[PDB]
Each structure stands twice: as C-alpha cells, then as structure tokens.
Amino acid sequence: RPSTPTILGYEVMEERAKFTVYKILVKKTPEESWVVFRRYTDFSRLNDKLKEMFPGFRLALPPKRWFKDNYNADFLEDRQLGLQAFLQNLVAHKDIANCLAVREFLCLDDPPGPFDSLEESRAFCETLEETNYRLQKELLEKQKEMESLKKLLSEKQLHIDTLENRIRTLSLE
Amino acid sequence: TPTILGYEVMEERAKFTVYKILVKKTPEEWVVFRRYTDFSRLNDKLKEMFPGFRLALPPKRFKDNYNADFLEDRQLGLQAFLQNLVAHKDIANCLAVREFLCLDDPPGPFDSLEESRAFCETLEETNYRLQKELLEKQKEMESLKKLLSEKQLHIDTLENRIRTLSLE
Question: Superkingdom of this entry's organism (chain B)?
Fold first, then answer.
C-alpha cells in the first residue's frame, strides 16, 4: 500500500546518443523516502508484465515516438504527466500495487538511497540496444515455432492425400 | 569490385564496429564506412528481392563482442559478401545495393563519416521496423494455427468417410 509515487522531473542524459530518465520520488513512510530513475522503456516493460498477469485490467501509457522529436519540451512534459497518471493508477489497485514486478520496479524492498541510484538504474534499465536484442531473439524463436507449424501442416496434408487415395480406391471397388 | 581496407571500433559512448571500405568500379577513380549492421540489413533485403540466392555470413552475437580472430573471419566473410554482391548483375544494380554503396550519386573521398551517419538506420527506426515484423509474424502464425485447425477437421471428415465405405 505505498504512498503515491510522484515524478519529480526528467533529465536528458548523453551517451553521444541521448536518452531521457525520469526522477521518481517514492515514499513508504512519511519520514523516509528515496528516488529511482526510470526510462520510458521501463514503464513499458512493466505495463507489459501487468497486461499479462492482470489480463482483466488495462493501464495507460502515453504514446511512443519513433519519428517526431523525442526530446521535444512540450512532448516530454506531456509524456511525464502521463507517466505520473500511470503511477497513480499503478498503486491505486490493490493486487497490482503489491505485485512482485511492481515492488521490483519501485525498489520497495531494498531501496538505493541517494548516491546508489544511478548505479541501480544503470543495472536495471533496459537500453534501446538491449531491447532491440530481445526483439531479435523473439523474432528468431517465433521463427522456430512457425517452422514447426509449417512442417506439421505438411504432415497433416500428407495424411489427407493418403486418405483421399484410400477413398477413391474404395469407392470404385 | 569495391575492396575493404580494414576495421575500426568507433564509439559514441556505446561501442560499435565500422568497416573502412574502398569503393571503385574499374579503378583509377573513394572511401565509405559501413557498420556490420547495414551489411546484415542489406542481406535481409537481398533475401527479400533475391529469394533464390543466398549470400555470405550468418549471425553474430552472447560472447566476447570484440574478438580479433572473429574480426578477421567476419571481414573475410564480408569481402566474399561484396564479391557475391557484384557477381550477379541484378544484385549489383539492385536499388538497395546501388544506394548502399553510394553508387547512385557518390559524395567523393572527403565525405565518409557524414554519409555514414546519414545512411545507417537509427536505433529508433530499427526498433520500429523490428516491432512491425514481430506483429506481422504473429499474424501469420495465428492464421497458420487456424489453417491447421481446418486441416484437422478435414481429416476427421475423411476418416469418418473411410469407416463408412468400409462397411459397404
């Protein structure tokens, strides 16, 4: 039942390719509080696990941008408001707010404190690189299932050819 | 036949591999830099437009990313790959191929990295494409699952029919 996670701000970081992280204030007890830094991608993956584990519940993430400026000020602030709404709705549900993946997302178990937070985010956050890697892996696995299916389809088809032979043969005899 | 000079690890706070490629068609004529990733993507497009022709090198990976031995084997595979690109007339004149080597309207020898950043697809776009593919292939797979159910039904029908004729 954690007090409303509140997004404090965002900051655009630079690896010579920019990415945005969100400063999320998290409060457990009105006295002690800590901050975690999360990329949009992370909110995404979370919501994905939520759609799986809670199929009877849908939560809202603001849209993706593949094309229009990602680092636009109006857009980024919009994106933020949307993320805080996402969080409020995230804790307002009882099963969800205590969900395992949620507790990991907010570090409600072993919070970093200051100075530990960039470390934790660096370990946790999936980069676009790693995300794309995952996507390739899935693409391959789905290729596997698809071939398995096509083969299987071929087999059933062969059985059908056989049965038709058996039918045409018996009809004339 | 354009010939590769060497390899270099370039970096914008994420490590990536570029290949410094000399490009000439019947020499007495420039330099282009190309990521492995473009060779790969191009190879995918080749597998699209030229389905009955497969060219060289299969995947890289989960292991040490920079391995000098692996580096040279990969490069040899790449010059062979270029060799295969020029060996078929159609491949050599394929749109994606002539655009790839800057064969349409080449920049000349000083413009190398500029064109390189301009050409390579950004990580955002790569990710968009990949998502699209994943969705398409799930659609296909679902249609397929359906098809298999249909075929199953047909088999049930025919078995019933043979049992029928059996007694008659």
Answer: Eukaryota
